Amino acid sequence: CVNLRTRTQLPPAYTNSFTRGVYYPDKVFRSSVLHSTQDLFLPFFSNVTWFHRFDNPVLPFNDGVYFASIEKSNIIRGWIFGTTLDSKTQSLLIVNNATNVVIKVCEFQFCNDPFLDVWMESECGVYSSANNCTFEYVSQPFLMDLENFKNLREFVFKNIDGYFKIYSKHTPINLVRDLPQGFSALEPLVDLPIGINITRFQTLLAWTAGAAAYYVGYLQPRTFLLKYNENGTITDAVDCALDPLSETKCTLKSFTVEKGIYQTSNFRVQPTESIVRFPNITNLCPFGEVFNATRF
Amino acid sequence: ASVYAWNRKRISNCVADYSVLYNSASFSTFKCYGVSPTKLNDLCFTNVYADSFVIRGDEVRQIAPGQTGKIADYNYKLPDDFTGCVIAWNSNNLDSKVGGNYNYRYRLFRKSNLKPFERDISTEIYQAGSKPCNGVEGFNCYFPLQSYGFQPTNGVGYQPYRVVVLSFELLHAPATVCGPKKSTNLVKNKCVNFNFNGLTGTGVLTESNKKFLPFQQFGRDIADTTDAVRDPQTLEILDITPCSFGGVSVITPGTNTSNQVAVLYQGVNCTEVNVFQ
Amino acid sequence: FQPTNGVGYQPYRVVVLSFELLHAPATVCGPKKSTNLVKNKCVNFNFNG
Amino acid sequence: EVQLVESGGGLVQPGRSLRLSCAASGFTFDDYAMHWVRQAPGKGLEWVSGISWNSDSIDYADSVKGRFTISRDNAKNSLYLQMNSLRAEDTALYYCAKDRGYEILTPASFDYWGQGTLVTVSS
Amino acid sequence: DIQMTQSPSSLSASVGDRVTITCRASQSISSYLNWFQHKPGKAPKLLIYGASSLQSGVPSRFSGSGSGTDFTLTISSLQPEDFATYYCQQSYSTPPYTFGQGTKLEIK
Amino acid sequence: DIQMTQSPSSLSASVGDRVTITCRASQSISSYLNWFQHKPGKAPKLLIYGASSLQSGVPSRFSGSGSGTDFTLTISSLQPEDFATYYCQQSYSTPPYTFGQGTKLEIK
Ligand SMILES: *[C@@H]1O[C@H](CO)[C@@H](O[C@@H]2O[C@H](CO)[C@@H](O)[C@H](O)[C@H]2NC(C)=O)[C@H](O)[C@H]1NC(C)=O
Ligand SMILES: *[C@@H]1O[C@H](CO)[C@@H](O)[C@H](O)[C@H]1NC(C)=O
Ligand SMILES: *[C@@H]1O[C@H](CO)[C@@H](O)[C@H](O)[C@H]1NC(C)=O
Ligand SMILES: *[C@@H]1O[C@H](CO)[C@@H](O)[C@H](O)[C@H]1NC(C)=O
Ligand SMILES: *[C@@H]1O[C@H](CO)[C@@H](O)[C@H](O)[C@H]1NC(C)=O
């Protein structure tokens, strides 16, 4: 396709994730209760890779991705998921272009730099060929404009039980070069019923280079204690294995603890290796005589 | 299709009638795990899976949760908590050739047992020893796929069989595969015996504005008790309240003295049930 | 016994294997390799099964 | 509801060749086996040849081996039968039958037939 | 080679009668027999595929039975639309699809 | 039609001997064979109905075996009251109750 090499080499930065990445784990309504659940969550105060200049390399997909972006002109269009991305294996494609949301599961021929160019957008050079197409889907019609920061969009992608789950949220923010310290609940958006195998992914951008950045975080299985207010919305949460005080809160099922000594769990030394000790006899058992006999 | 390339068909948006399937006599094996076949009519499911393939005669028993075998480990694996039904029938009239049908392949060797409900398509040469195969079959290089020798003259236990398994999954999602049941008119503010997409139970359907419920259907309490439900026909938030409970305490003097009693229902505002409060 | 008998009437040779396990030194083991012995280290040992 | 109409019947000399066709319109021709059947003027039915759902397995009757070549055209739903070196005993009536399965050698038999086309081998 | 034989040659019955047509196979065919009703004026039809499996589209009055080297076909009523010739075909031996002789049925 | 055949023609043994009389069927009869002892001076009797089922009222010395197209009958002792003619009868094919030829047994 088209290769762009005017990209300065910068090592990825890092930033504190704080308490971002808490979503509704199910579709049941609860109010004014403290519920403990086990699910794939983003750990509190985790390490988030920070990208900016055009930076969009291939990134892994282990168990889930917390994708965040703060922009002013919506440079990001969509996402590409797959394993080989060269029509050798089925791959996922999402493009939230100026027209609508289009989702396809066809096998494309992705070049080494899929990107969109633009005020009007004319160059559509993310892929070259498409064959053996299986699934498609388009959302309702809506038009979006092509032209410190004002809004923050954060997404969570999960792929389990042959289902592609997308959670999203959009909130205003007055920050520019820092992620907000606060709480925001993510509600489910769509649940694609497609069983793709995904291990790697990449992001699309839409000559003029814009000033924007996006944040990437990885999920892992954790236990959380969620607090629902009177209106059934999540107001506070506790990462249940961050520090010993968090473990105490899980045991007492409350967000406040009085003075005292509490028993939380049990310490156990784990084994390091294994040893096998068998006698050194090498003669074989007489099974041929039992089976390969003539007269019983 | 073949064992290692088993098909999977998505089933959704159905008025599913299982009576015709039950009444058919063309199936030799009709076994269901966790669901009574006669009870399939009223139940509603969020999604239904239909997997079809062809295997050998002796392997029809191997298709069950917690079963071990070559096909069970290397070709097809069922979850231990599987629920649904299994359908299989012989196909000598269709899948048998006097010269031997060589269109059916199954996997012999692989690195390790595969996780339940996953597909293997790669046909790489298995490394049975230490000699690198480098894409060349030979010693310590066994092709993992073997072809069944299906012929009409073969024994009954060896005959080809076609297998179709139905798996039903239930979760907190709007069910789209329901049965042929008529929905009746709604009656509220009375002690009724409702049924909301298989959610059985009794109570009174008061109208309550519990919350917005932008995408949610059920509402729960400390116990596994559905407090509020969303109507399936229209979009309103109904509220479930159980009928009246209580106790009958009998106030009596000694039967030696006289024969009279006075009944007390505690915790009952018996405007609905010489009346005292 | 004759070669002309029916399938259900044919002779059958039966061989049955029975295993007994009790407080005795195990003598019929499988093809399992023996590793080294490590002391003063929490390990998962396997001494004669 | 299926239609099976043949052609190619006529008068030819011994040892001469003639070409048959048979049009199918009432079903899906791409996934069924097809057969040719011979009916002598004063005898019973006799099987001649058959082809699979695709041109993979082809079988011929013993008396017609090395003389007949049954073809197939899945594009326009039409099969063929080229008879070579016809003799005087091949003056029978030929039908264009359809198999219930997709194989040339199966317990599945012929469910639908068609009106035959009469051929004569004489001078 | 396998030889396929027809015991009856010509039968006669009434509109409220019941006759049985039998077909004997020289070698065992393991319930792989087919019955065809060949009306002399048009294309033949199929009645029973396999030993005792009745094809959809024909009345359930007909019924077949037999396995191995002995088979039988019966008609319960012989209604005024059943006058035709019936053939028994085997599909199990190496000679492909050997047909038996005819069996004319004229009701009188 | 089915042809029913007798391999032996005439046998001779002693009071402490043991002989076997065999009967072959041209077509499979599926273990439906019967053996009869026809004393030439009086009415015949039945010894074994079915392949290997022994009728009540006769000694258990006799024993039959066979299925399909091969059958055999044996006498363990040939006691001085066993001189007679033995017939094998099939009851499975369309020709009803076809008898095989005789097999004279004179002990000497
Ligand atoms: C004696 O028994 C042994 C094992 O119980 C048999 O050995 C194997 O037999 C199979 C089948 O013939 C072969 O594929 C293997 O290569 C044999 N392995 C070895 C190590 O010999 C053996 O066949 C039996 N003997 C007879 C005569 O059947
Ligand atoms: C993120 O990881 C890098 C390297 O692994 C480490 O130097 C840095 O301290 C980490 N971030 C935090 C907040 O600990
Ligand atoms: C619930 O929503 C109402 C709006 O009707 C709002 O006034 C109230 O503050 C909300 N509850 C909480 C705990 O904020
Ligand atoms: C189905 O229910 C919806 C709910 O309002 C209604 O609008 C629609 O007319 C109904 N359709 C039928 C066919 O009953
Ligand atoms: C019982 O119900 C009546 C009317 O429903 C109400 O006025 C009364 O207060 C109730 N009793 C109590 C103890 O609340």
For chain F, domain boundaries: 4-107
Interchain contact, E36 vs D108, CB within 8 Å: no
Closest CA to A31 of B211, B217, B241, B199: B211
Residues of B with CB under 8 A from a CB of D: 92-94, 96-99, 101, 152
Interchain contact, B222 vs A33, CB within 8 Å: yes
Specify the CATH class of D4-121 in words. Answer: mainly beta
Question: Two tokens at A46?
Answer: 């985790």
Rounded to a whole number of angstroms, the distance from the CA of B163 to the nearest CA of chain D is 18
Residue A161 CA, ligand 3 centroid: distance in Å = 36
> CA angle, corner A40, sides to A38 and A44, nearest 5?
95
DSSP annotation of B271? T
Q: Whose CA is nearest to atom 4 of ligand 5?
A: B271
Q: Residue E63: CA atoms inside 13 Å, Cβ hemisphere, count?
A: 6
User: One-letter amino acid identity for F48?
Assistant: I
| Alpha carbon B27 to chain centroid, angstroms | 20
What is the four-CA torsion angle of A185, A189, A192, A193, rounded to 10 degrees? 80
Closest CA to A22 of A41, A37, A38: A41
Contacts of F84 (CB under 8 A, 6+ apart): F37, F38, F39, F40, F105
* Method by which this entry was solved: cryo-EM
Specify the CATH class of A13-268 in words. Answer: mainly beta
- Closest chain B CA to residue E53: B26
Per-residue 3-state assignment (H helix, E strand, C coil) for chain A = CCCCCCCCCCCCEEEECCCCCEECCCCEECCCCEEEEEEEECCCCCEEEEECCCCCCCEECCCEEEEEEEECCCCEEEEEEECCCECCCCCEEEEECCCCEEEECCEEEEEEEEEEECCCCCEEEEEEEEECCCCEEECCCCCCCCCCCCEEEEEEEEEECCEEEEEEEEEECCCCCCCCCCCCEEEEEEEECCCCCCCEEEEEECCCCCCCEEEEEECEEEEEEEEECCCCCEEEEEECCCCHHHHHHHHHCCCCCCCCCCCCCCCCCCCCEEEEECCCCCCCCCHHHHHCCCCC
Give me the phi and psi of E93, to 5 degrees please.
Answer: -95, 170
Contact B133, B127 (CB under 8 A): yes
Who lines ligand 4 at CB under 6 A?
B 233-234
User: One-letter amino acid identity for B197?
Assistant: N
Closest CA to A96 of A184, A179, A168, A196: A168
Residue located via tokens 């006599």: B25
Give E92: exposed, middle or buried? Use CB within 10 Å, 0-12, 13-18, 19+. Answer: buried
**Resolution of the structure in the document, Å:** 3.6
d(CA A93, CA A76): 14
Contacts of D56 (CB under 8 A, 6+ apart): none
d(CA B233, CA B178): 13
Q: Report the nearest atom of ligand 5 relative to the CA of B269.
A: 1
For chain D, how many helices (H) and strands (E)?
Answer: 0, 12
Under DSSP, is residue B191 helix (H, G, I), strand (E, B) or coil? strand
Question: Two tokens at A286?
Answer: 């007489």
d(CA B219, CA B230): 9
Contact D56, D121 (CB under 8 A): no
**A234-239 β-sheet, strand order:** A34-41, A220-228, A234-239
CATH number of F4-107: 2.60.40.10
Q: Dihedral sign, CA of C6, C7, C13, C14? A: negative
E 30-89 near D (Cβ less than 8 A): 32, 34, 36, 38, 42-46, 49-50, 55, 87, 89
Question: Two tokens at F87?
Answer: 């017939």
DSSP annotation of B101? B
Question: Two tokens at E10?
Answer: 């010509």
